[PDB]
Amino acid sequence: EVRDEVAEKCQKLFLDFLEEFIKYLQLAEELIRPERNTLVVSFVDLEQFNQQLSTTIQEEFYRVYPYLCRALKTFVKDRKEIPLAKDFYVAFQDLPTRHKIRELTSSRIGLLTRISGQVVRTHPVHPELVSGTFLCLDCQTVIRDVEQQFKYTQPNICRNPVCANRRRFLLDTNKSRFVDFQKVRIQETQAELPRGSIPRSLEVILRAEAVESAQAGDKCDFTGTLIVVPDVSKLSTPGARAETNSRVSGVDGYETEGIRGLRALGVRDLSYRLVFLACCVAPTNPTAESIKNQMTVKEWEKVFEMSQDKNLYHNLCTSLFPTIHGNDEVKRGVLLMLFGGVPKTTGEGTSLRGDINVCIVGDPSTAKSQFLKHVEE
Amino acid sequence: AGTVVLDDVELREAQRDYLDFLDDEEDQGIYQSKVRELISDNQYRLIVNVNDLRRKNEKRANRLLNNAFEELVAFQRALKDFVASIDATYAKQYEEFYVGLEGSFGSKHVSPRTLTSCFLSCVVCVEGIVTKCSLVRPKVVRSVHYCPATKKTIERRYSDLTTLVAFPSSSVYPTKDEENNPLETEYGLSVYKDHQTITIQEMPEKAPAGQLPRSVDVILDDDLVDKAKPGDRVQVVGTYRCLPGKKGGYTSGTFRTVLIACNVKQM
Amino acid sequence: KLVIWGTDVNVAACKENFQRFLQRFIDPLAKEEENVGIDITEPLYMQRLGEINVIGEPFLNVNCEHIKSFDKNLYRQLISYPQEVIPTFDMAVNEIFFDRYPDSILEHQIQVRPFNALKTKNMRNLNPEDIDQLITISGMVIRTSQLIPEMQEAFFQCQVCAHTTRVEMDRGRIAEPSVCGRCHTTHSMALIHNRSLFSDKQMIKLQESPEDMPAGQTPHTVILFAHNDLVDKVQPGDRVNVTGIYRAVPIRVNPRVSNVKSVYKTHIDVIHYRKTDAKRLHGLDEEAEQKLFSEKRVELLKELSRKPDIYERLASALAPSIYEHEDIKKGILLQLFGGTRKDFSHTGRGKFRAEINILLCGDPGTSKSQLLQYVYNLVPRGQYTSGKGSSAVGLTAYVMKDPETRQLVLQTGALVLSDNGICCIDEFDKMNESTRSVLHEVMEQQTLSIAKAGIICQLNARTSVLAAANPIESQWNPKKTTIENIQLPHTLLSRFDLIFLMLDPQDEAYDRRLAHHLVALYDMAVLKDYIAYAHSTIMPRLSEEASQALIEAYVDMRKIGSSRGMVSAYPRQLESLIRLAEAHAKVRLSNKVEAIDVEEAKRLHREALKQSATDPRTGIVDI
Amino acid sequence: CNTDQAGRPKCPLDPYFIMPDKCKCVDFQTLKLQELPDAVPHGEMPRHMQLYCDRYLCDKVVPGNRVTIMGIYSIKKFGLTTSRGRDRVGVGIRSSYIRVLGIQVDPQEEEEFRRLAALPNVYEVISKSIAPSIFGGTDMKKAIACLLFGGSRKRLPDGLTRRGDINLLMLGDPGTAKSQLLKFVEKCSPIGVYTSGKGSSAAGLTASVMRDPSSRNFIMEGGAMVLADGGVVCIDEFDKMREDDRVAIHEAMEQQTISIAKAGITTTLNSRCSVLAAANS
DNA sequence: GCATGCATGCGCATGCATGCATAATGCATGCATGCGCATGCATGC
Ligand SMILES: Nc1ncnc2c1ncn2[C@@H]1O[C@H](COP(=O)(O)OP(=O)(O)O)[C@@H](O)[C@H]1O
Ligand SMILES: Nc1ncnc2c1ncn2[C@@H]1O[C@H](COP(=O)(O)OP(=O)(O)O)[C@@H](O)[C@H]1O
Ligand SMILES: [Mg+2]
Ligand SMILES: [Zn+2]
Ligand SMILES: [Zn+2]
């Protein structure tokens, strides 16, 4: 068979990185649980460990990543007993560079990028095929391990030399391989808008554990790949297309006319669209016990310092509204509305409001919209 | 089929040429008395000298020898026209009349051993002896049926060898009415024509010594049924054509060649 | 071959011709005005190649008219058959570059880009004779789609023995191997898209601005296809020039069939972009680059700025064919300069409007409409709306779906296309309250918020407004007060920086001067350069003296405007004073605002409203 | 049926018929070839081959000829048909044959002949040339020479004919050099047949007629007399002839024709032969 | 006259009856001829 040198070297060096630089052994210890599939690795550790390896992975992310997955699988298999059915994936967080959405071009297809955006919509979760198994309907041969990529792809040809079947197959879902799947829409932020331009919209795809996060309305940074997916109704006019290299001509009664000739030569239209696959999703800027535990010691010190100050009533008024003169009553009301009350329910099935609503009526130019803008900010 | 033809220069000109050929008014021709003799004798075919035609019109003779079927059709049409002209009453009896050929064909004078595919679709002359003959059999041309349930009579026309190629839609014998009422065949009103098949062999006196003989198969139509008998030395002039095999998927590519007689002469 | 089939082009002859021309061409007419940064006494294009070697830009721009001046055969051959001519030019340039400057590092070789083909014809005048020929376009961009990746080299992998091959696209079609190269299996080769090579594509829609217009011709929309580096070089609202080839493409009957229609489609393949124009002011693209090589012009303008009357001179030079109304022209000039664009995001206040909005209220028998027309025609990124003709959804943005593709969710309106520009509104009275509701937020927050089904977004609308209005009776009735004559809500009026109450004094000197001027009706470049330099090189700032002068002006204005009948004052007038003072500081090319600027701003504010002649306790203007 | 028909209803399955009158045809023949008896291995049955002849190669070879043939070795192709018969041992065997591409069958001279014949001494030269190896018999040699040249046949206005060929008889003691002259005559004449009484090994002396029962054809078998026309027939052992041949030879010698009548057929065959016979005491 | 209500109007999605496209292989039958048999005719001695 034919092997890849770069893939082998990347496998060896990434195994060296996982074995030598150990947090990742402790995370593989957590990886035993059935709800965990992904290992999270910091990229600054890659930069420190080997600049050459980091550069190779950045310039060859798509080509190398499946082999890093196999290396991780071998590592966890050596360290612990896990059934071979389960898969495992690698993640990266701390990229030192950012790229704007419009800066994404065709030259970056397949490499590792990191962008920023705002979530607009999230679709429900579904299972998906990764590698299928098919049965030939003519000669009953079993074909296993057909890669699906990004479309429902049947086997190219029946592996029996005499059969040569390419159109009739059955799918045995029991032997197949699955992965979780979710779709999300993101939008370009306002600060990145050029003159007179509508924000750009992009589609992001989450697989397995990363599916959970990125709810609607968030403002988050993504790190992953930029990948090309085919489309159907893009070309109302003829464009680039595929064909076969065989020098085959028709015969009388079976002349290669339009439809039959196109079907005989296997002509397919080459249409494509750009899709982003995400492997790391983070907040752009980051159950009372959980909140307390999340905060560090210095943050908790600051919170406690704030807690026991009476001037908290005064200083919060001036902090949020430094420029507006007077109108301290409105500031106090807005702060009270922000903090809010406690909702309750009664035994008869009724409910009681716990929120506060505020209205401002005033003469022109009395800073009336400034409060709204400050609360929005 | 509603397809019709409006103009055809070649066929119309050939018909005009035969019309001028068989006039015999400003010439010493005899064909007028021949037609009168045919009317007197109730026969329905004519024999015309090929050399005479070549002398009067060489181009028509060349075309007729090189191409047979269309030119023969034009001859038959011209005969129908002139028989109608001289006596339209007699032309009512018969559907179409026929043409015989006579004279020295020259290069086309061909022995059963020297008949080749080069002479296909042309008129050839052959001298031989008769070896096999078959019984005379009738063939249906026009069929007539009657329905006792509805007291209606219908008629169907058949044309098999008139057209070069036949299809399954034709040659179907009707037996039931449109409402499945049985039909009764009425053999008196139908039309039949006789049919016979003979075989001709090269004469042993002419064949090269010590070599096996070669033979040709001939079909005799309604008029020439009784003109031949086995063990007889004859000369046959007629078309040389291929035989259409019945429907199939795979064909070997070998046809059967059969000579269709137009003139049979006892030398 | 001596000639190419269907043409008369010779490859070697054209190569030698171009190589010689790159060294021989000299033009005396092109002075330092456009031969910028180049020694004129030397050949021009060789100096351009040397500058390319200095910078390393892999692209060279060539004017067609220079080539035509050198010879006509080369010009005609370049126009007629660009495909057979340009690739020769690429290698002709590359050989010279590598010979004269060996071992200079570049990522790829040089590509040549022609520009400025002389065609002043209406696009509807194009004919089939001109298919596949080089043409020029002057227009404005309104729609730009997303980038499309199009394949150039496919990658195949053997499913049986992992053998991999690459196939280069030829004639627009890819032929995948039907047999492997190491196991000889048939149809074992599969295509992998992500391993392939792709290129960028973009579709642009442009609105025509023809010089010659027949009778009764509707506006036109042109489809352009831009590839590689030309992507994202233009934005909606920009007025540009384009050089490219004219094409024709067949159209499918329906997407599911391969049949094509007989009537062809058409489009234009862009090759070159240009921003310079000899009638309108410079855009923001050129201002953000150090292209002020004309040190002579810099010195001349800096010496002019020190002269005292230059201000008035600018007010004189803004419009030669317009009458004695110098205050209006001064206000328009201060609008052109604009206030300083400070950053207040750290404060949390939000955006602060740094531009100038002006209102002109008067009878229809005046010249406000001509002023609006002149400002529209003078400044790039200008828009013009009139009365009820526009709707609330017509401005801002509206929901659409592509007639060519599946969807284009949102499309910009009049106001957004005017971003960083000027919008001129006429017949402001007839506009309904629905559109004024939009104007309320646009005129202050500089942003728009849109929330509809599946569409929540915020847009930038940093425009400057020139509004025209009429009295309710179409006459300035002196018995009614100013507020009663105007009949607009005070919230809308307060946001205008300057209000000009056009009135007819019926002075004999005015009549004589205007009659003489109107009957007699029977340096622009210097002004352009000065305006661009001032607008792009100086940030005004003010000291405590200006601060106290502004505060005194504010309290005096509040004292004067307290009386009913006249337009009352509000705190936004203080910010208007600040903006006018900063604009006046920009006029003098001064980074420091002096008390002179504040006093001039106060003078303009007082004179625009005619508060001096107006009776303070009755609200009636007198003479 | 490869026609674009939208809105129209479509043609059925298998709608095609062969038109016979619109085809191009060529000649076709098959031949059977046997291994040469000169090269067949001792004690082994000879092998056979089938040959294909097209267009102008037809009728260039008569059965019995010794031929050299250049061709292409091929197999028949009539589809993947199933094996037939009660024997199905052979698997994947296609009948083979040879496609024939070439066939070979195993006036200054006039000036020389005209120059020779004008001499007055040609008689002596010819007489000497006739078997010079044989001693004596100059008169016999001259008689043989004038036999070889032969007389002239004459048809007459009445339809009667008169023989134009010469008949000779040689009676003698054994060992008088008679057979050698007959063999020399057989070789010298352009056409010549040498036979004895009762015919030959597998060929009769006179023709016979039969009827093929399967396919009704009147077959005639060439005899030693019919096979020669204008040639010379040398006949040894004139005494051993059978009765039927003895009766037929009377007509064959006199009128140069043979008459045979059978059921449904009457034929007259030509036999224009000169006769040169030898006999014993 | 200006503010509000609202019957009309338009474009793209899915659901459902009709309508459209596909497409060689295996088995049976009559013609040619070998092989065993009995009758009968013709030919010798
Ligand atoms: N009390 C105040 N303190 C500071 N700035 C003020 C005050 N009142 C008004 N302003 C200024 O005046 C402007 C008021 O406009 P805005 O608040 O939009 O009016 P409205 O909200 O009534 O339409 C603001 O830009 C603000 O900077
Ligand atoms: N005069 C002669 N010259 C040469 N050879 C002779 C002569 N007489 C006899 N022979 C030889 O004797 C043999 C005679 O045998 P053959 O001619 O068969 O006798 P017959 O013809 O009587 O049967 C021949 O082979 C021949 O070579
Ligand atoms: Mg407000
Ligand atoms: Zn199979
Ligand atoms: Zn392979």
3-class secondary structure for chain B? CCCCCCCCHHHHHHHHHHHHHCCCCCCCCCHHHHHHHHHHHCCCEEEEEHHHHHHHCHHHHHHHHHCCHHHHHHHHHHHHHHHHHHCCCHHHCCCCCEEEEECCCHHHECCCCCCCHHHCCCEEEEEEEEEEECCCEEEEEEEEEEECCCCEEEEEECCCCCCCCCCCCCCCCCCECCCCCECEECCCCCEEEEEEEEEEECCCCCCCCCCCCCEEEEEECCCCCCCCCCCCEEEEEEEEEEECCCCCCCCCCCCEEEEEEEEEEEC
Cα distance between residue B16 and residue C155, in whole Å: 74
Residues in CB range of B237: below 8 A, 6 or more apart: B100, B101, B102, B105, B123, B124, B125, B126, B261, B262, B263, B265
The residue assigned the tokens 């900010």 is A377
Nearest of B81, B55, B76, B108 to residue B259 by alpha carbon: B108
Would you state the structure tokens that stand for residue D156, as one six-digit string?
Answer: 């007459």
Cα distance between residue C558 and residue A181, in whole Å: 65
**How many helices (DSSP H) and strands (DSSP E) are in chain C?**
19, 21
Measured in angstroms, how far is the CA atom of residue A268 from the centroid of ligand 4?
24
Burial of C432 (0-12, 13-18, 19+ CB in 10 A): exposed
Strands B215-220 and B256-266: parallel
**E strand or H helix at C220, and its extent?**
none
Subunits in contact with chain A (3 or more CB pairs closer than 8 Å): C, D
In order of A191, C214, C270, C443, the CA distances from C343 in angstroms are 13, 49, 38, 18
Query: Method used for this model?
Result: cryo-EM
* B65 and B124 Cβ atoms separated by less than 8 Å: no
Measured in angstroms, how far is the CA atom of residue A368 from the centroid of ligand 1?
7
Phi and psi at residue C214, to the nearest 5°:
-75, -170
In order of A236, A274, C148, C150, D27, the CA distances from A271 in angstroms are 11, 11, 9, 8, 58
In order of C323, C514, C517, C610, C621, the CA distances from C507 in angstroms are 15, 11, 16, 17, 16
Residues of A in contact with D2 (CB under 8 A): 253-255, 257
Q: Do chains B and D touch (3 or more CB pairs under 8 A)?
A: yes
Breaks (C-N over 2.5 A) in chain B follow: none
In order of C535, D112, D122, the CA distances from D115 in angstroms are 128, 5, 11
Burial of C177 (0-12, 13-18, 19+ CB in 10 A): middle
Cα radius of gyration (chain B): 21
Cβ of D56 less than 6 Å from ligand 2: no
Phi and psi at residue C535, to the nearest 5°:
-70, -25
Q: Which residue of D has its CA nearest to B68?
A: D21
Nearest of A24, A11, A13 to residue A52 by alpha carbon: A13
Cα distance between residue C239 and residue C422, in whole Å: 14
* C488 and C469 Cβ atoms separated by less than 8 Å: yes
Q: Do chains B and C touch (3 or more CB pairs under 8 A)?
A: no
Pocket test for ligand 2, best of D134, D141, D170, D180 (most atoms within 8 A of CB): D180
Measured in angstroms, how far is the CA atom of residue B121 from the centroid of ligand 5?
58
Measured in angstroms, how far is the CA atom of residue A357 from the centroid of ligand 3?
19
> Across the interface, which of A2, A120, A270 has its CB nearest the CB of C163?
A2
Which of chain E's bases lie under 7 Å from a protein CB? Answer: 3, 11-13, 20-27, 32-33, 44
Total residue length of chain A = 377
Cα distance between residue C433 and residue C325, in whole Å: 32
Cβ of C441 less than 6 Å from ligand 1: no
Known binding residue A366? Answer is yes
CB-based contact A270 C255, cutoff 8 Å = no
Q: How far is CA C99 from the centre of its chain?
A: 40
CB-based contact A245 C237, cutoff 8 Å = no
Q: Which residues of A119-158 are buried (b: 16+ CB within 10 A; e: fewer)?
A: bbebeeeeeebeebbbbbeeeebebeebeeeeeeeebbbb
Distance (Å) from the alpha carbon of A252 to chain D's nearest alpha carbon? 10
Nearest of C502, C608, C530, C18 to residue C313 by alpha carbon: C530
Cα distance between residue B149 and residue B143, in whole Å: 19
Cβ of D180 less than 6 Å from ligand 2: yes
**E strand or H helix at D261, and its extent?**
strand D257-262
Minimal-distance CA residue to ligand 2 atom 11: D177
Distance (Å) from the alpha carbon of D267 to chain A's nearest alpha carbon? 55
> Across the interface, which of D20, D209, D222 has its CB nearest the CB of B209?
D222
- Name residue A169's beta-bridge partners: A136
**Does the CB of C258 have a partner CB in chain A at under 8 Å?**
yes
Cα distance between residue B214 and residue B228, in whole Å: 19
**E strand or H helix at D165, and its extent?**
none
Cα distance between residue A320 and residue A331, in whole Å: 8
Helix, strand, coil percentages, rounded to 5, for chain C? 35, 25, 40
Would you state the structure tokens that stand for residue A133, as one six-digit string?
Answer: 């198994």
Nearest of B215, A329, C375, A43 to residue D219 by alpha carbon: B215
CB-based contact A272 C150, cutoff 8 Å = yes
Breaks (C-N over 2.5 A) in chain A follow: 21, 286
Would you state the structure tokens that stand for residue C47, as one six-digit string?
Answer: 């100096």
> Across the interface, which of B203, B209, B250 has its CB nearest the CB of D79?
B250
**Does the CB of A259 sit below 7 A from strand E?**
yes
Q: How far is CA C243 from the centre of its chain?
A: 17
A 181-220 residues with CB below 8 A of C? 187, 190, 193-201
- Helix ranges (H only) for D20-156 are 108-117, 122-129, 138-149
Cα distance between residue B24 and residue C240, in whole Å: 94
Would you state the structure tokens that stand for residue C159, as one six-digit string?
Answer: 């499913």
Cα distance between residue A93 and residue B71, in whole Å: 95
**Does the CB of A120 have a partner CB in chain C at under 8 Å?**
yes
* B99 and B262 Cβ atoms separated by less than 8 Å: yes
Binding residues of D for ADP: 162
**E strand or H helix at A73, and its extent?**
helix A61-79
Minimal-distance CA residue to ligand 1 atom 25: C572
Cα radius of gyration (chain D): 29
Measured in angstroms, how far is the CA atom of residue A162 from the centroid of ligand 5?
17
* B159 and B170 Cβ atoms separated by less than 8 Å: yes
Cα distance between residue D212 and residue D194, in whole Å: 30
Strands (E), C209-275: 221-227, 239-249, 265-274
Residues in CB range of B70: below 8 A, 6 or more apart: B11, B14
Nearest nt to C434, CA vs C1'?
Answer: E3
* C94 and C210 Cβ atoms separated by less than 8 Å: no
* D199 and D205 Cβ atoms separated by less than 8 Å: yes
Cα distance between residue C358 and residue C613, in whole Å: 21
Secondary structure letter of residue D53 according to DSSP: E
Phi and psi at residue C426, to the nearest 5°:
-115, 155
Would you state the structure tokens that stand for residue C410, as one six-digit string?
Answer: 């949102």
Minimal-distance CA residue to ligand 2 atom 4: D134
Give the Cβ contact number of residue C425 at 10 Å.
22
Cα distance between residue D272 and residue D20, in whole Å: 47
Binding residues of C: 323, 349, 368-369, 470, 495, 572, 575
What one-letter code names the amino acid at B45? R
Total residue length of chain B = 267
**Does the CB of C410 have a partner CB in chain A at under 8 Å?**
yes
- Name residue C32's beta-bridge partners: none
Exposure of C275 in the CB half-sphere (CA atoms within 13 A): 14
The three-class DSSP label of residue D102 is strand
Cα distance between residue A108 and residue A228, in whole Å: 11
Cα radius of gyration (chain A): 29
> Resolution of this entry in Å?
3.1
CB-based contact D14 B249, cutoff 8 Å = yes
**Four-point Cα dihedral B122, B124, B129, B134, nearest 10:** 30
Nearest of D217, D209, D193, D199 to residue D271 by alpha carbon: D193
Nearest of A59, A63, A113 to residue A280 by alpha carbon: A113
Residues in CB range of C308: below 8 A, 6 or more apart: none
- Name residue D258's beta-bridge partners: D269
